[PDB]
UniProtKB/Swiss-Prot annotation, chain A:
Protein name: AdoMet-dependent rRNA methyltransferase spb1
Quaternary structure (record): Component of the nucleolar and nucleoplasmic pre-60S ribosomal particle.
Biological function: Required for proper assembly of pre-ribosomal particles during the biogenesis of the 60S ribosomal subunit.
Annotated localization: Nucleus, Nucleolus
Organism expressing this protein natively: Schizosaccharomyces pombe (strain 972 / ATCC 24843)
The family this protein is said to belong to: Belongs to the class I-like SAM-binding methyltransferase superfamily. RNA methyltransferase RlmE family. SPB1 subfamily.
Transmembrane residue ranges: none
From Swiss-Prot, chain B:
Native source species: Schizosaccharomyces pombe (strain 972 / ATCC 24843)
Disulphide linkage map: none
Subunit structure: Component of the NOP7 complex, composed of erb1, ppp1/nop7 and ytm1/SPAC890.04c. The complex is held together by erb1, which interacts with ppp1/nop7 via its N-terminal domain and with ytm1/SPAC890.04c via a high-affinity interaction between the seven-bladed beta-propeller domains of the 2 proteins. The NOP7 complex associates with the 66S pre-ribosome.
The protein, known as: Ribosome biogenesis protein erb1
Job of this protein: Component of the NOP7 complex, which is required for maturation of the 25S and 5.8S ribosomal RNAs and formation of the 60S ribosome.
Residues of the full protein shown: 101 to 198 of 740
Compartment list: Nucleus, Nucleolus; Nucleus, Nucleoplasm
Gene from which this protein is expressed: erb1
From Swiss-Prot, chain C:
An example Gene Ontology biological process: DNA replication initiation
A single GO cellular-component term on record: Noc2p-Noc3p complex
Protein name (Swiss-Prot/TrEMBL): Nucleolar complex-associated protein 3
Section of the entire sequence shown: 223 to 742 of 747
Predominant localisation class: nucleus
UniProt keyword list: Coiled coil, Nucleus, Phosphoprotein, Ribosome biogenesis
Summary of the function given for this chain in its UniProt record: May be required for synthesis of 60S ribosomal subunits and the transport of pre-ribosomes from the nucleoplasm to the cytoplasm.
Protein localization: Nucleus, Nucleolus
The organism of origin for this protein: Schizosaccharomyces pombe (strain 972 / ATCC 24843)
Membership in a protein family: Belongs to the CBF/MAK21 family.
GO MF term list: chromatin binding
Keyword Nucleus: yes
UniProtKB/Swiss-Prot annotation, chain D:
Name by which UniProt lists this protein: Uncharacterized NOC2 family protein C1142.04
Cell compartments where the protein resides: Nucleus, Nucleolus
Range of the intact protein held here: 482 to 637 of 707
Highest taxon, organism lineage: Eukaryota
Family named by the database record: Belongs to the NOC2 family.
Length: 97, 92, 409, 110
């Protein structure tokens, strides 16, 4: 069992736990809300699919998590020598023309 | 009286790490804390090229090393991010 | 009997499932022949596309399930034969190599790849290793999508972790074989024509989307393959084992495809470190990285200082040629100082190597001629005259040394 | 155990001629009563090789790699003698300012 943090909402949360800005005990207490008690254990797919699309609490989002996600999504070959030189070159020569 | 103490869960506490300059400058009583040596370039490349599970990318002010959430912390984040009860054994 | 059953299976594979069962029941020479017949029958009857797990469709699905069960039984028997381990083992290895070459896209290919990796993971050179390596290289070269290559890379990474990055040097060479990183008419009814036109339009749209999807999938697979290879190479470098040369060669080959920041950080890792040979390899890797088109004093100092402990020749000659090939980076009175140590160290080693080293400066466009005599100040640690060799080089065991010295003079 | 055989072969080669092997033997864990005798034999062979090549104009240049190796590694006396020989060779080379065409002066100095 594992988990892959790919949603920025989770990253804002993960940053808060690690950076100790928001206390862990307070986070646990803040997790007992109207939405956590709407359990999803065993519900049919035709119900869950609309519930996630509609009844999804929109948590706040921080720019720091956005940057961190971009860092995670940055592939090893995202910007190699060619994609940083000729891709810059084609834009430059296009602007010249 | 009330002893003017601090509870273990008070919202105000020392050390406020931020998004990963090194704040290895001083400590209480105005003494310079020794700066931990920078990690080996091979190890730093390994961490940068392979993000650890729950890689927050946040560095504490005392040391330049990053802080990564442990298995239980990843478990709590999973429960919180998926909107379920953050206590495994608590009958709702 | 086996040949007749194989001929019957070839003619009508749909209704010859019992023939396969009879062949399995009939399965040292007889066992080898049965295994060869089973492999040939499986290769001839295996579909060229991946079978999706669950009379026009139902019967075909049932036939596919029966064929999959027969293949699984054959794979289980092959695994037992491989684990039992000589001629039978070699035949099984050849059959496994043929299955990998042919049925790479088919089901249970991960199990076949895992069995091949386990056989190759042995410290000793087991029979069929060359065939397995050749099959893997052919698969890596042919896999444009790279999904099979990514699966093989993950299998190799697991084997390396199990072996603590201690395997044969040829195992690491499989990474360099990844091609991704190395990149009149019949009459038709009136209604039929409308269907044909719609099918053609759908095919064109599907082909265009597939090309875009292939480009994205190839890029994602290449990044994942690079991540696995770099992590394995970094772990091997951390272990500082005997595979450092293979790791350095793989790093140099795949350094161009990495990010700019990673390329810059790799220099620090290289500079952070058979010690002379390792230092020479690190210097060569640094020179290769700097030699990348479109673009190191510590590495230069290390290369200059490593000459004395050395006193490998081809690598040194290639490094000197690359340094000479550098545009205006040499021959500014510094090359002569660097070549002075090389001339001094040239009193030993084979005469052919010494002649090649002398010819490297002889063919140089620089007009300096004092490199073979007193020269300018020797900075960069020094250990020499700051402010002769050919005279002593003439008196040598090899008679051609004197002739070479006279020709140079 | 076979070091004395190598020393005898080195001495025979030196006589026939009239360094890397001697340095390796000297730097060996055995050298770096039998060990002392082998070290003395190696020092004598090194001195004989240095004396044979002392006539060459490039004697300080050739002995420079050996001097650096010896400095990094009786041994003190041999190093001092080698340094003195290199200094004398350098002084002779500095005095011999003749061009390479006039090799007679170098031969006369040799």
């Amino acid at each position: 069992n594992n988990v892959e943090i790919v949603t920025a909402e989770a990253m804002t949360l993960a940053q808060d736990i690690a950076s100790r800005r928001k206390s862990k005990a307070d986070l646990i207490d803040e997790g007992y809300n109207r939405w956590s008690f709407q359990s999803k254990e065993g519900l049919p797919d035709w119900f869950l699919d609309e519930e996630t699309t509609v009844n999804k609490p929109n948590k706040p989002i921080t720019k720091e998590a956005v940057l961190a996600l971009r860092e995670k999504m940055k592939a090893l070959n995202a910007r190699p020598i060619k994609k940083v030189l000729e891709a810059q070159g084609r834009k430059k020569m296009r602007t010249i023309k | 009286e009330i002893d003017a103490g601090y509870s273990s869960d008070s919202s105000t506490e020392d050390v406020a790490p931020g998004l990963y300059n090194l704040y290895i400058n001083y400590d209480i009583d105005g003494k310079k804390i020794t700066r931990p040596a920078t990690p080996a370039a091979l190890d730093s490349l390994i961490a940068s090229i392979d993000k650890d599970k729950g890689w927050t990318g946040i560095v504490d002010p005392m040391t330049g090393k990053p802080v990564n959430l442990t298995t239980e912390e990843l478990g709590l984040l999973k429960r919180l991010a998926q909107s379920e009860i953050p206590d495994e054994n608590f009958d709702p | 009997a086996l040949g007749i059953q194989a001929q019957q299976l070839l003619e009508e594979p749909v209704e010859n499932l019992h023939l396969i069962r009879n062949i399995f029941e009939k399965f040292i020479t007889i066992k080898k022949l049965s295994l060869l017949t089973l492999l040939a029958v499986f290769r001839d009857i295996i579909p060229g596309y991946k079978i999706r797990p669950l009379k026009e469709v139902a019967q075909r699905w049932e036939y596919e399930q029966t064929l999959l069960k027969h293949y699984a039984k054959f794979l289980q028997t092959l695994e037992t034969i491989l684990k039992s381990f000589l001629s039978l083992y070699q035949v099984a290895v050849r059959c496994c190599t043929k299955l990998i070459e042919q049925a790479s896209h088919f089901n249970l290919s991960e199990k076949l790849f895992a069995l091949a990796v386990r056989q190759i993971s042995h410290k000793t050179k087991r029979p069929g290793f060359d065939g397995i390596i050749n099959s893997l290289k052919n698969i890596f070269e042919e896999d444009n999508l790279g999904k099979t290559s990514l699966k093989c890379v993950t299998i190799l990474s697991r084997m390396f972790k199990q072996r603590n990055y201690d395997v044969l040097p040829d195992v690491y060479d499989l990474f360099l074989s990844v091609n991704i990183l190395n990149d009149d008419l019949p009459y038709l009814t009136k209604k039929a024509r409308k269907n044909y036109k719609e099918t053609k339009k759908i095919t064109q749209e599907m082909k265009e989307a597939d090309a875009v999807i292939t480009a994205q999938d190839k890029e994602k697979y290449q990044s994942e393959i690079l991540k696995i290879i770099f992590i394995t190479y970094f772990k091997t470098l951390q272990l500082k084992g005997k595979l450092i040369g293979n790791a350095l060669e793989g790093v140099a080959r795949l350094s161009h495809l990495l990010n700019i920041e990673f390329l810059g950080d790799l220099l620090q890792v290289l500079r952070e470190l058979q010690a002379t040979r390792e230092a020479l390899l690190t210097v060569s890797t640094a020179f290769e990285i700097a030699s990348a088109q479109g673009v190191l004093g510590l590495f230069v100092q290390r290369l200059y200082k490593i000459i004395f402990p050395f006193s490998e020749m081809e690598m040194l000659l290639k490094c000197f040629q690359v340094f000479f090939f550098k545009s205006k980076n040499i021959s500014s009175s510094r090359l002569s100082s660097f070549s002075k140590r090389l001339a001094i160290a040239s009193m030993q080693l084979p005469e052919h190597s010494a002649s090649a080293d002398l010819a490297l400066l002889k063919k140089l466009l620089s007009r300096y001629s004092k490199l073979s005599r007193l020269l300018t100040s020797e900075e960069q640690i020094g250990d020499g005259i700051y402010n002769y060799e050919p005279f002593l080089l003439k008196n040598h065991y090899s008679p051609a040394v004197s002739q070479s010295a006279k020709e140079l003079l | 155990q076979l070091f004395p055989m190598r020393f005898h072969i080195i001495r025979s080669l030196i006589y026939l001629s009239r360094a890397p092997s001697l340095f390796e033997v000297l730097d060996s864990s055995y050298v770096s009563v039998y060990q002392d005798g082998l070290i003395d034999q190696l020092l004598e062979l090194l001195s004989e090789y240095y004396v044979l090549y002392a006539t060459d104009i490039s004697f300080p240049e050739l002995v420079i790699p050996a001097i650096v190796r010896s400095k990094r590694f009786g041994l003190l006396t041999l190093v001092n003698r080698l340094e003195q020989q290199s200094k004398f060779m350098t002084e002779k080379r500095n005095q011999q300012k003749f061009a390479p065409i006039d090799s007679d002066s170098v031969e006369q100095f040799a």
